[PDB]
Structure 1
Amino acid sequence: EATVARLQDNLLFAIKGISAYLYHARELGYTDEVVDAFLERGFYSTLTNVNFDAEEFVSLALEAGEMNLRTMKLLKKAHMDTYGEPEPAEVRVGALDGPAIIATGHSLKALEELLKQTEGSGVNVYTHSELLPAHGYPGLRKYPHLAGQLGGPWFDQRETFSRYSAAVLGTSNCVLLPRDSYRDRMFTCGVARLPGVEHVDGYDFSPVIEKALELPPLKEEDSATLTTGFGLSTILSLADKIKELVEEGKIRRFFLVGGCDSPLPQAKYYTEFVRKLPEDTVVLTLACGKYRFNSMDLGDIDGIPRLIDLGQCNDSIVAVELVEALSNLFSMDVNELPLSIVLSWMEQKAAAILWSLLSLNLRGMYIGPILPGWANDDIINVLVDKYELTPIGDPEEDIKKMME
């Protein structure tokens, strides 16, 4: 039927995300055999004339969410064991004088190697989109020529890359066909590829550095700031203040807003939402959706930041950790916390994280811009009604329903 095809394609999307995280984990030298065996099994379950059962495909998607939790935890372990655990970090958004390299994507091993290969050369390495969290890691902020942030979300890149006479390095996910304005100024490594752009051999970034030096330098602009790298230790070392502040009702609610973004007009929702959120709530944010609002002056709530940047998409594992630290902190069940979840969700890119969240039986979440919601019975009707997954609507009404 149609639903069997839709369900196997969704499982394949989850397997893709898990494989992304697994690839980056292997690049840092961490490998889990059980997740690889699940990749084999799950992908194999989608060959023609093997499995015709929709409910078994839902079971497989939930097992995929579990495996995604496993590999996200493994990748977090890799990142912390190589670069330290991320601590809060304010980051400059604007050009500094000099030659420059803009690195975009997810991988921190490529950024590590580039930063190692750019010492003393006098080129500034800027982060973009999901390389912003790198600024919070001790073993990465230590390089002083990691200048700051430049640009915002991934889908702005053709704009950003256009207006900065800097070398361009797409390390991983969410890369986009270059304008010929900067095509000959762009490079890729790892798995990312663009036709007509040079691909770095291994981690030998001489071609980019050379290019960065053949280019007119950047000129310093008026900048702005961002905050990122809120690692778990920082958050649950603040547990006393959060306890005291939510017991007196001076912090009413935690909202978890974030996820993979897109230039969809409906995604403007996430800018309005946090804008209308009452000033006595705190927002936990991750992945690219953060650029919908992470530049707003939200303020402080008794010295606790109203915006808390947990990092990149694969840092979902810290959020799920925090809630189990929060529940045990309040002696509450997981669904008794003053927590609402508003996802920004792409079907292709972040199916794995949604299925991980459903594996934990989290009820009443709000889903991404458009609803890929598989129209037919078993999926949308039965699965939504069981997990009470909710499509986003109007910001004010959604906030009213979430506060109650």
Structure 2
Amino acid sequence: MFCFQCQETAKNTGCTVKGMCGKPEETANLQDLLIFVLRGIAIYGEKLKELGQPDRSNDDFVLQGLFATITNANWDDARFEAMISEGLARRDKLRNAFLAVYKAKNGKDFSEPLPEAATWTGDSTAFAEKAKSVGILATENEDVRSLRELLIIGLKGVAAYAEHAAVLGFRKTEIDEFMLEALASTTKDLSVDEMVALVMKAGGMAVTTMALLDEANTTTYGNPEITQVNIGVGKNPGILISGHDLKDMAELLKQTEGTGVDVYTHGEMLPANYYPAFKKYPHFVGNYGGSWWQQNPEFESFNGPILLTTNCLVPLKKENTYLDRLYTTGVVGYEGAKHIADRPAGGAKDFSALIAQAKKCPPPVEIETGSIVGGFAHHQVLALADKVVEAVKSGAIKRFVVMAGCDGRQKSRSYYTEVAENLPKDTVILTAGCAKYRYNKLNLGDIGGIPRVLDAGQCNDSYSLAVIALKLKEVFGLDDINDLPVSYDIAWYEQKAVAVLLALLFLGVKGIRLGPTLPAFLSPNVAKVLVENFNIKPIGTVQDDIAAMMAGK
């Protein structure tokens, strides 16, 4: 196999036998075949737009197909076979529509050479073998491979956020059009300038999509606000909801109300605690456990059903017993886990089986007590702008350090904890995404009532951090966002984090430290471009990086 799209890729080079995440050969290869079929859809969908007859009927299928191939999203080979088969059928529908429109506009049959992604077909028995030859290693030039895969990796991150927006009824044609432009581009022979421009365009579409998801989430559930979140437990059976999808949360809360089953969040659902629409339910207890990579023992000890709305779902250990109460939904899949089907238009998912099972379960094991404070998204922080700016001006707050992003399991990640612990006491950490779990249960206190860790929310709520930085740029009358007293020490893990990074590069943020290692999918020459254009940096020692950041370097 060959996969290198996440931080934990083997030898920081590529997973070749079995993924470090657990993804086996067969699954990895099926994901490659799905992306190949998506490129085929893209080739005809882009041509139909160019002819003036765009067909948007595959928008959601494309988002969902890309999302299903994100790290720790979907482990169910039968789901990938179904998506490949359905993708071939959708592709051929687009092909036949394109052939007819082309013939009408040109007075002759289409006869131009097309990439294999546009024309190959087979039944599911053919998938495993074909999959071997249509993966990443089919592109041998290292710079073409690097810029095509960087584009697809950021694009999948954008697709995940676009899917959450779409679930909530928010869509923009430019996003779905770009999915096909970007996919199709990876079958074309393009100059380096053209390939780099597409990656930067992906960063601008990450800005568009992150803004759209921020609009979707806050229009539907309110602006996040300062909240103290219990991390202890109650004495009722519960359901634990994990991943990122807030509409699933809204429906689970409504369905569990009055049933005697409590709701708990996990992982990237912690920010559901911050939204006014959800704070109104008394049976919403708080947040259980820690980061995604700790979920085997914590899903076990939770005792009730667990609902994965998105990644990260990690394979069970052999001694884990919770498969019978593990539920997937959305693009998530796992062999042997019960899947909650998509809601129909104008309808709701049905979580009744989780509720019935919960009542047969013991209450959660308490693994810690106390609280986490959060809800500092853009409306809440701008509400405090005068106090924050006074603190800057008085020197009470010397610097902000953005430590947003995505966590993972490697030991080197203790760096982020150590940076948080060792930063001077007149600094404030800004965070979003599960990278927060390296430092959100410390006792760093506050500065004149402003907490020293400000959690804006999910990794997508890195959007709020950019909005805050742009506002402060204007308040301080600066010509360059980089001259703010803000440093960026971002942790990444999978493809959403990469989308966030590309958004920040599109916004002109330079000097970012990215870790705990750099992507395997940057060739030497592509790494150099990003260094020359954006001064991206690897992490160094805790003491060295703190001292450089405090100097604005």
| TM-score greater than 0.5 by the shorter chain | yes
Q: CA deviation at 1:58?
A: 1.2
The answer to whether the aligner puts 1:31 opposite 2:177 as a matched pair is no
Among 225, 247, 250, the alignment partner of 1:109 is 247
Taking the aligned partners of 1:127 and 1:187, their CA distance within structure 2 comes to: 14
Taking the aligned partners of 2:368 and 2:485, their CA distance within structure 1 comes to: 39
Q: CA deviation at 1:164?
A: 2.0
Q: What do residues 248-306 of structure 1 show as CA deviations (whole Å, max 9, x unaligned)?
A: 22211011002011101111110000111000011101100000001111111111111
The answer to whether the aligner puts 1:206 opposite 2:352 as a matched pair is yes
Report the secondary structure of 1:58's partner residue: helix
Taking the aligned partners of 1:306 and 1:69, their CA distance within structure 2 comes to: 27
Report the secondary structure of 1:102's partner residue: strand
Quickly say closer, same or farther: Cα 1:324–1:296, change in 2 above 3 A: same
Instruction: Tell me which residue corresponds to 2:156.
Output: 16
Amino acid at match of 2:217: H
- Within-5 A mapping of 1:245-256: 245-256=391-402
- Within-5 A mapping of 1:347-362: 348-362=495-509
Taking the aligned partners of 2:514 and 2:211, their CA distance within structure 1 comes to: 23
- Within-5 A mapping of 1:34-73: 34-47=174-187, 50-73=188-211
Larger deviation: 132-141 or 228-237?
228-237
Report the secondary structure of 2:429's partner residue: strand
Among 203, 219, 228, the alignment partner of 1:81 is 219
Instruction: Tell me which residue corresponds to 1:153.
Output: 291
The answer to whether the aligner puts 1:236 opposite 2:376 as a matched pair is no
The answer to whether the aligner puts 1:331 opposite 2:477 as a matched pair is yes
Instruction: Tell me which residue corresponds to 2:260.
Output: 122
CA contact (8 A) 2:150 2:521 kept: no
Report the secondary structure of 1:367's partner residue: strand
The answer to whether the aligner puts 1:94 opposite 2:232 as a matched pair is yes
The answer to whether the aligner puts 1:132 opposite 2:278 as a matched pair is no
CA contact (8 A) 1:167 1:186 kept: yes
Report the secondary structure of 2:515's partner residue: coil
CA contact (8 A) 1:96 1:221 kept: no
Taking the aligned partners of 2:156 and 2:145, their CA distance within structure 1 comes to: 16
Quickly say closer, same or farther: Cα 1:94–1:192, change in 2 above 3 A: same
Taking the aligned partners of 1:383 and 1:216, their CA distance within structure 2 comes to: 52
CA contact (8 A) 2:243 2:309 kept: yes
Taking the aligned partners of 1:399 and 1:16, their CA distance within structure 2 comes to: 32
Taking the aligned partners of 1:312 and 1:222, their CA distance within structure 2 comes to: 22
CA contact (8 A) 1:112 1:140 kept: yes
Report the secondary structure of 1:390's partner residue: coil
Report the secondary structure of 2:514's partner residue: coil
Q: What do residues 162-183 of structure 1 show as CA deviations (whole Å, max 9, x unaligned)?
A: 1121111111121112344101
Quickly say closer, same or farther: Cα 1:243–1:345, change in 2 above 3 A: same
Instruction: Tell me which residue corresponds to 1:271.
Output: 417
Q: CA deviation at 1:329?
A: 1.2
CA contact (8 A) 1:128 1:150 kept: yes
Q: CA deviation at 1:19?
A: 0.8
Amino acid at match of 1:80: T
* Alignment RMSD: 1.4
CA contact (8 A) 2:243 2:311 kept: yes
- Within-5 A mapping of 1:146-185: 146-179=284-317, 180-185=320-325
Report the secondary structure of 2:271's partner residue: helix
Q: What do residues 95-139 of structure 1 show as CA deviations (whole Å, max 9, x unaligned)?
A: 210111011000000011000000110111100010000111001
Larger deviation: 215-224 or 325-334?
215-224
Among 190, 197, 209, the alignment partner of 2:330 is 190
Taking the aligned partners of 2:353 and 2:232, their CA distance within structure 1 comes to: 24
Report the secondary structure of 1:311's partner residue: coil
Q: What do residues 168-212 of structure 1 show as CA deviations (whole Å, max 9, x unaligned)?
A: 111112111234410111111111111100001331001111111
Report the secondary structure of 1:324's partner residue: helix
Residues matched between the structures, number: 402
Q: CA deviation at 1:90?
A: 0.7
Instruction: Tell me which residue corresponds to 2:95.
Output: none
Q: CA deviation at 1:375?
A: 6.0
Instruction: Tell me which residue corresponds to 2:493.
Output: 346
TM-score, normalized by length of structure 1? 0.96
Amino acid at match of 1:5: R
Instruction: Tell me which residue corresponds to 1:369.
Output: 516
Flag structure 1 segments of 5+ consecutive residues without an equivalent: none
Q: CA deviation at 1:43?
A: 0.6
Quickly say closer, same or farther: Cα 1:382–1:88, change in 2 above 3 A: same
Instruction: Tell me which residue corresponds to 2:543.
Output: 396
Q: CA deviation at 1:362?
A: 1.0
Taking the aligned partners of 1:375 and 1:309, their CA distance within structure 2 comes to: 30
Report the secondary structure of 1:262's partner residue: coil
What fraction of aligned residue pairs are identical, expressed as a percent? 42
Taking the aligned partners of 1:347 and 1:194, their CA distance within structure 2 comes to: 19
Q: CA deviation at 1:398?
A: 0.5
Amino acid at match of 2:546: I
Instruction: Tell me which residue corresponds to 1:381.
Output: 528
Quickly say closer, same or farther: Cα 1:359–1:222, change in 2 above 3 A: closer
Amino acid at match of 2:258: G
Instruction: Tell me which residue corresponds to 1:260.
Output: 406
Report the secondary structure of 1:350's partner residue: helix
Report the secondary structure of 2:313's partner residue: coil
TM-score, normalized by length of structure 2? 0.71
Report the secondary structure of 2:302's partner residue: coil
Among 430, 450, 453, the alignment partner of 1:284 is 430
CA contact (8 A) 2:289 2:367 kept: no
Q: CA deviation at 1:374?
A: 5.1
Q: CA deviation at 1:377?
A: 4.1
Taking the aligned partners of 2:205 and 2:258, their CA distance within structure 1 comes to: 42
Amino acid at match of 1:206: S
Taking the aligned partners of 2:174 and 2:546, their CA distance within structure 1 comes to: 41
